[PDB]
Design a protein around this ligand. Structure first.
Ligand SMILES: NC(=O)c1ccc[n+]([C@@H]2O[C@H](COP(=O)([O-])OP(=O)(O)OC[C@H]3O[C@@H](n4cnc5c(N)ncnc54)[C@H](OP(=O)(O)O)[C@@H]3O)[C@@H](O)[C@H]2O)c1
Ligand SMILES: O=C(O)Cn1ccc(=O)n(Cc2nc3cc(Cl)ccc3s2)c1=O
Length: 315
């Protein structure tokens, strides 16, 4: 089916539109087209610096009577410089104002690491190390819970949390809301079998990001693995008369994951949603899982000393 049930009773579309690196000059058109061809879930973040333009597109399609707010599933994320409990609500409200919404369907702690509060999103010292903040995940979570109680957001969750960071929250004394979602990197070179098993066994829905391997990521090296150009995956697609991207989007869907491929190119936006008319076989699934190399798009060395850096742990 097209939607998956969350712990709060709401249903989440399993295919959404990513917006990281979608320039402000193009993401309004991307979103409009996306809604026109069927997308109802949009993945956003304050750090992507384009939530206003995303908001422009939603507002207009609401105005046009193309969609109703209730049919939309809008996700955003609390950036790292706002982990202090006194900053959380303001950060949420800024996102809501920018998107021109009165609630979010889902709001995530973007990363488990808090960074020094201030205007810079990535504060570094004179030697380039990220400057942390003295916040911890449990106090940040409690501040996220308050947003649910105040009606700003319908569900809360986490992103880039390892299973021990997830358990810290689950085991929180006085926990009010369990996380609904853990949004993590996931694709054939980073298949996340252990963390997915963990999360799904705890009734936490997993959303896969960079499912196409983020070729537009700014730190890409020419020699890095390229999913979209992998000849083995090209062959699986050719057999189904689909593109490599469609194969890469359909793969996590068949794992009971949500997936959020990014594009600002109208034809690719449309292409990427045409993944409900075919099935990957059991062999296809097995083959794609066998490509795991434990290889991350997102894992910058500049964060690796943070006390809460998530990827020292096996999962
Ligand atoms: N939670 C977090 O920490 C986190 C981290 C990373 C990403 N995410 C979210 O996950 C989303 C997806 O990940 P991502 O943006 O890193 O990368 P991605 O979705 O893996 O790949 C996007 C890249 O693929 C290209 N593309 C899209 N459809 C294509 C197609 N059919 N054929 C060929 N190329 C295609 C896009 O090009 P064009 O756009 O130029 O068409 C863009 O360069 C993000 O936008 C963001 O919403 C969350
Ligand atoms: O966060 C997003 O959704 C998109 N994005 C944008 C810029 C960027 O550098 N990254 C890489 C990061 N790695 C860590 C790793 C850790 Cl531990 C904390 C923060 C980050 S940000 C990134 O993923």
């Amino acid at each position: 089916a097209s939607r998956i049930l969350l712990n709060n009773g709401a249903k989440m579309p399993i295919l959404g539109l990513g917006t990281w690196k979608s320039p402000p000059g193009q993401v309004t058109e991307a979103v409009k087209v996306a809604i026109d061809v069927g997308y109802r879930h949009i993945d956003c973040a304050h750090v992507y610096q384009n939530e206003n333009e995303v908001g422009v597109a939603i507002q207009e399609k609401l105005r046009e009577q193309v969609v109703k707010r209730e049919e939309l599933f809008i996700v955003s994320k609390l950036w790292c410089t706002y982990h202090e409990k006194g900053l959380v609500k303001g950060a949420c409200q800024k996102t809501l104002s920018d998107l021109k919404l009165d609630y979010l369907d889902l709001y995530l702690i973007h990363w488990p690491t808090g960074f020094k509060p201030g205007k810079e999103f990535f504060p570094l010292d004179e030697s380039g190390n990220v400057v942390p903040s003295d916040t911890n995940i449990l106090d940040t979570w409690a501040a996220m819970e308050e947003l649910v109680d105040e009606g700003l957001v319908k569900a809360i969750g986490i992103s880039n949390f390892n299973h021990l960071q997830v358990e810290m929250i689950l085991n929180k004394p006085g926990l009010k809301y369990k996380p609904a979602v853990n949004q993590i990197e996931c694709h054939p070179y980073l298949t996340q079998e252990k963390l997915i098993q963990y999360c799904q066994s705890k009734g936490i829905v997993v959303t896969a990001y960079s499912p196409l391997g983020s070729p537009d990521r700014p730190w890409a090296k020419p020699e890095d693995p390229s999913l979209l150009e992998d000849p083995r995956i090209k062959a699986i697609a050719a057999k189904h008369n689909k593109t490599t991207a469609q194969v890469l989007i359909r793969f996590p869907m068949q794992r009971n994951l949500v997936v959020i491929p990014k594009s600002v190119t109208p034809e690719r936006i449309a292409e990427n949603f045409k993944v409900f008319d075919f099935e990957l076989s059991s062999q296809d699934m097995t083959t794609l899982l066998s490509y795991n190399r434990n290889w991350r798009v997102c894992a910058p060395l500049s964060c690796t000393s943070h006390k809460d850096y998530p990827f020292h742990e096996e999962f």
